[PDB]
Amino acid sequence: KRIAVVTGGMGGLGEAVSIRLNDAGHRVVVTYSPNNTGADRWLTEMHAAGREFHAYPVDVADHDSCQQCIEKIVRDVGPVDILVNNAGITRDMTLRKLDKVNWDAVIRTNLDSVFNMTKPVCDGMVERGWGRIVNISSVNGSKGSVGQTNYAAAKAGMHGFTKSLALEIARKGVTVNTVSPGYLATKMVTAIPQDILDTKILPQIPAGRLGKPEEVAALVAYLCSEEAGFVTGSNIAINGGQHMH
Amino acid sequence: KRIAVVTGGMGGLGEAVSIRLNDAGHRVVVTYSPNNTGADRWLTEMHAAGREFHAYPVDVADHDSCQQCIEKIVRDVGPVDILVNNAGITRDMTLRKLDKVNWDAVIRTNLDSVFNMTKPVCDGMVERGWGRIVNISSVNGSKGSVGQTNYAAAKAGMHGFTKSLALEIARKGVTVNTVSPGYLATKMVTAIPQDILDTKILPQIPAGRLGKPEEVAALVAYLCSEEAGFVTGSNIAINGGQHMH
Amino acid sequence: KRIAVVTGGMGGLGEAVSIRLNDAGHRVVVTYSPADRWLTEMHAAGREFHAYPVDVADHDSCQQCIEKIVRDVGPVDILVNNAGITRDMTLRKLDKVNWDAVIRTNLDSVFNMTKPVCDGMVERGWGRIVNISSVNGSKGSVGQTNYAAAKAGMHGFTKSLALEIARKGVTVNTVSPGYLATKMVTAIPQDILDTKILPQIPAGRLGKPEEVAALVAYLCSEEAGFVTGSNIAINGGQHMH
Amino acid sequence: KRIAVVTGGMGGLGEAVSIRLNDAGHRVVVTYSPNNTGADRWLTEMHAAGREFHAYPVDVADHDSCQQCIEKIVRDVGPVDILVNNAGITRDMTLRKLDKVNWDAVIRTNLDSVFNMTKPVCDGMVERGWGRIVNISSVNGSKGSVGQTNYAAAKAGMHGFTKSLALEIARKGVTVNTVSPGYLATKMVTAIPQDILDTKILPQIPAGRLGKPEEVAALVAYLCSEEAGFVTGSNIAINGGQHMH
Ligand SMILES: NC(=O)c1ccc[n+]([C@@H]2O[C@H](COP(=O)([O-])OP(=O)(O)OC[C@H]3O[C@@H](n4cnc5c(N)ncnc54)[C@H](OP(=O)(O)O)[C@@H]3O)[C@@H](O)[C@H]2O)c1
Ligand SMILES: NC(=O)c1ccc[n+]([C@@H]2O[C@H](COP(=O)([O-])OP(=O)(O)OC[C@H]3O[C@@H](n4cnc5c(N)ncnc54)[C@H](OP(=O)(O)O)[C@@H]3O)[C@@H](O)[C@H]2O)c1
């Protein structure tokens, strides 16, 4: 089996990605953040639903934390074949209100994380002549959003990274792609009051519904498959038609 | 079982798509150009390999030809759930040398075809609340190419169609997407002398190899699957890194 | 002077482009669908144009028009492909006649008008071709499978041609406008503009045809020689990518 | 007269921008970095060629440095109407060899700078109902580049910032746009030896020549003009056809 690492693999989209990659026959390793005290309960729950994951702590905003995390995974589980950079946060405020701490938290967590997690896995992928790296961006990287100068900068920057790295390692059988989801039915979105969902969110989506986390997971599984080896440097929109270009 | 129509389904990329959709479980119908003299021989060969197709003649440049073809498919096989607009030609000439006849041949065959074949299938898909339309473009629609003012205009036009149609019918469970392949190992390209392939074509492709038509077919199958419902109005690049944006 | 041709140059956006290019120092020629009142009015205002009737969907009409222009004025340095129509209808109801009318008028015209001027530009080592597209080519629009196909196709043409002739000092670019304050848009009642159109535009107003004309004048200038194969959005933020 | 601030205003492209904005009738203030010991000499040189500039020190990677710089400019010169975020560096290394120091240097200098410089000028532009913000990206943000996971991430991130801010403040008469140059005839590009220029650089450029810094300056001046008020959230390519999409 291919070994896959999914950052934020216990969160909304992350769990759906982890579940799908497991179901596709990959051996899945998730990370959990310093704020996450529920790793044991999550592992037990996942096993109750028939699935075995490995879990390791990491701070994706810290270079050394990432290096050490990957070192342990290679030691305990094995060489990393697939990396899904899914960890990310929001700190939404208009530029007028936005302070440096909240600019920084988003750039460091959402963009530095791509450098920090991808650098320690690439050499092995290249050496073996096979790898898949998938970066989870956002429709808001593509179109921008009010309150998201920080988030859009980070998420658009992710795709700049995708393209440069794709060029460096495409010849070695490693693909690097960006996935840009629209609104998904994760906890923080399904919690939105119905009046706002009906008048402000759903009318932006031609499909007329939220995307399922499982649908984004399916796209990630496709990119991670043996038959997706000719797709590289791309940014795939999965947004119900919310944005087209 | 979903019923799929694949235009240009009997050779090159079309054949690969038709095989993949069949193996995905769909009932596949192919179109062939009216003066294609090998339809029965193709069906025999495919049936000898365990695949049961239907095949109908059509001129995709002719509006009435297309309407009537779909009517026969509906009568004989059943309602069309999936359409892959794959038929197309090249008539490469720099603008300096390009004539109106060859401008028209490419616009009519490559762009008018999308209107001609899609119009007769959409109402049924909308009525039933499910459909998939996949338009096959080219990397050259994205980046342009010398000698292809006609082909790039047609192929870029196809994606304009994709986006407008996607908006009209998204809310009714029908997706419309464009797939843009780079260099593929179809008969016309593998016929390239090996030294020309190595010195002139491969250096344009970071992957360092031609794409397999089966790889493109796999992407089309993903888009046609039940789990790709939140992808619409998109243009997915499958080009080994030849073009990024 | 450079000589400029503006198709559809006597009304709407075309008129604003024609005026701006004249005022930039170009000798301007306009085309119209089958002009003295407009020509005389422009003359009174200190602007000398030539006007020719042309069917931009018809290849021979375009070739013959360009012949007259080279005779009467001189070789064409600048071409703005602005002529275009809409025939809006959802795919369900759109007939072949109205698909064709839009592809032929909006897309074939680019081939028909550009082919007869490009060789001269290349021979001389300088030229400017500007294709007027639409935001709706970039984003799609309901009832515009035809219009978006034609307008997106225009930019495929831009990119291929740009590659053919960049080395010889000719640039080819697309301009994609949003909502403009032309006659048929300003005829919209203010209540409908305020509640239906303006909320789509972050700028909160219609674009002026003169603003689009200024961008076209920039592209046609001596200092825009390193811009080619591009699609420039001028839409008040209505679409970004 | 409008007051313009050009970061990196004494460097290759920045000087050209500064000269053109002055010639267009604006009052131009340049910044100079901590490592620049030539401000006095540059001001003298510029005045000997007929132009009066103001110059202030700043470290664009440092939020407080930029806030203080802007305070001084407003005190000494006047409120800022036009901001050109032109300062940027390269630290080119493949991801395999790229260390965190050089990742950070490029993200903080090239992307954090857009937040650090733009935040302190935006309120005033909004208050007066007129402003122009122009962010200098790169063709390599659009296409990616080998050795530039850092630079392309930063440069693509700049445009994410552009789009989100443009949405926040378009209604207030302020525009925000990205300009993405190709190869320019600045000191370090013209220094490249002739064999590499001829075989590696120029063949990537359909125009067959380097871009003049003055050409990019012309575009920036256009964007800063009173007539460009309906252009916002855009990314304008000025690259001699090197990349198209
Ligand atoms: N939901 C949507 O509609 C949507 C749309 C577009 C894009 N996205 C993207 O989807 C991704 C996942 O977010 P989500 O929607 O699933 O929200 P979420 O449940 O809040 O997940 C965010 C994940 O980020 C991880 N994380 C944050 N900071 C971290 C750090 N310093 N170190 C390690 N891990 C860290 C968290 O790990 P722990 O759980 O261990 O704390 C968490 O699993 C994000 O990149 C987001 O930008 C979501
Ligand atoms: N030349 C090209 O081909 C090309 C192509 C695409 C994009 N660009 C972009 O154009 C911009 C200008 O670069 P250039 O080509 O003109 O090269 P350059 O002469 O090296 O200019 C870079 C400028 O950045 C300033 N700078 C760097 N770090 C700084 C800091 N920490 N604080 C304040 N200022 C700082 C420098 O200021 P001092 O001079 O005061 O030290 C300098 O003027 C960059 O953003 C670059 O990415 C250039």
Mutate to test the pocket of ligand 1, among A6, A13, A108, A235 (most ligand atoms within 8 A of CB): A13
User: What's the CATH number of domain B1-245, 3.40.605.10, 3.40.50.720, 1.10.260.40, 3.40.1800.10?
Assistant: 3.40.50.720
Instruction: Provide the token pair at A208.
Output: 């007329």
Give the single-character DSSP code of D3: E
Residue D144 CA to residue D147 CA, distance in Å, equals 9
D237 dihedral zone (left: phi>0; alpha: psi -120 to 50; beta): beta
Cα dihedral A95, A97, A101, A107 in deg (nearest 10): -30
Cα dihedral B8, B10, B13, B16 in deg (nearest 10): 130
Q: State how far the alpha carbon of C55 is from the alpha carbons of B112, C61, C183, D209, in Å.
A: 21, 6, 23, 38
Residue C36 CB partners (closer than 8 Å, separation 6+): none
Residue nearest to atom 32 of ligand 2 (CA): D59
Cα dihedral A75, A78, A82, A84 in deg (nearest 10): -40
A140 close to B (CB below 8 A)? no
Residue B55 CA to residue B72 CA, distance in Å, equals 11
Residue B122 CA to residue C120 CA, distance in Å, equals 46
Nearest to C49 by CA among C80, C10, C82: C10
- For chain A, helix (H) and strand (E) counts, in that order, are 10, 7
Instruction: Provide the token pair at C196.
Output: 């239906």
Residue A58 CA to residue A67 CA, distance in Å, equals 9
Residue D199 CA to residue B54 CA, distance in Å, equals 53
Instruction: Provide the token pair at A122.
Output: 């690439």
Q: Which residue has the tokens 């811009």?
A: C227
Q: Find chain B residues with C-beta within 8 A of A232's C-beta.
A: 206-207, 240-241
CB A4 within 8 A of CB A83: yes
Instruction: Provide the token pair at A135.
Output: 């970066």
Q: State how far the alpha carbon of D212 is from the alpha carbons of B144, C83, C104, C214, D18, in Å.
A: 25, 33, 39, 22, 14
SS3 (DSSP) at C227: coil
**All chains having 3 or more CB pairs closer than 8 angstroms to chain B:** A, C, D
CA dihedral sign of residues C3, C8, C14, C19:
positive
Q: Residue C140: how many CA atoms within 13 Å on its side-chain side?
A: 31
Nearest to A155 by CA among A144, A163, A165: A144
Mutate to test the pocket of ligand 2, among D85, D150, D151, D186 (most ligand atoms within 8 A of CB): D186
Q: Which residue has the tokens 């970061």?
A: D7
Instruction: Provide the token pair at B25.
Output: 């479980």
Residue A190 CA to residue A202 CA, distance in Å, equals 12
Residue D236 CA to residue D245 CA, distance in Å, equals 12
Which class for B70: exposed (0-12), middle (13-18), buried (19 or more C-beta within 10 A)?
Answer: buried
Q: State how far the alpha carbon of C229 is from the alpha carbons of C173, D131, D211, in Å.
A: 5, 29, 15
Which CATH code is given to the segment(s) C1-241? 3.40.50.720
Q: Does residue B83 have a known ligand-binding role?
A: no
Contacts with B, C 19-58, CB within 8 Å:
none
What is the C-alpha end-to-end distance of chain B, expressed in Å?
Answer: 37
Q: State residue B52 phi and psi, 5-degree precision.
A: -100, 105
Residue A90 CB partners (closer than 8 Å, separation 6+): A106, A148, A151
Helices (H), B129-211: 139-143, 149-169, 187-190, 194-196
CB B16 within 8 A of CB B40: no
CB B159 within 8 A of CB B136: no
CB B118 within 8 A of CB B133: yes
SS3 (DSSP) at B84: strand
Interface contact flag, A237 B234, Cβ < 8 Å: yes
Across the beta sheet with D27-32, what order do the strands follow? D54-57, D27-32, D3-6, D82-85, D131-136, D174-181, D235-238
Q: Which residue has the tokens 């979105």?
A: A189
CB D162 within 8 A of CB D235: yes
Q: Residue B111: how many CA atoms within 13 Å on its side-chain side?
A: 37
Which residues form ligand 2's pocket by a CB distance below 6 Å?
D 7-8, 10-14, 31-33, 35-36, 58-61, 86-89, 109, 136, 138, 181, 183-184, 186, 189
CB D133 within 8 A of CB D177: yes
Q: State residue D219 phi and psi, 5-degree precision.
A: -65, -45
Instruction: Provide the token pair at D216.
Output: 């990019």
B145 close to C (CB below 8 A)? yes
Q: Per-residue DSSP letters for C112-143?
A: HHHHHHHHHHHHHT-EEEEEE--HHHHH--TT
Nearest to D5 by CA among D23, D44, D24, D31: D31
Helices (H), D131-211: 139-143, 149-169, 187-190, 194-196
Q: State how far the alpha carbon of A244 is from the alpha carbons of A241, B23, B208, in Å.
A: 6, 31, 30
Query: CA angle, A132 as apex, B211 and A166 as ends, to 5°?
Result: 65
Q: Find chain D residues with C-beta within 8 A of B245's C-beta.
A: 142-143, 243, 245
CB A26 within 8 A of CB A82: yes
Nearest to A205 by CA among A184, A190, A220: A184
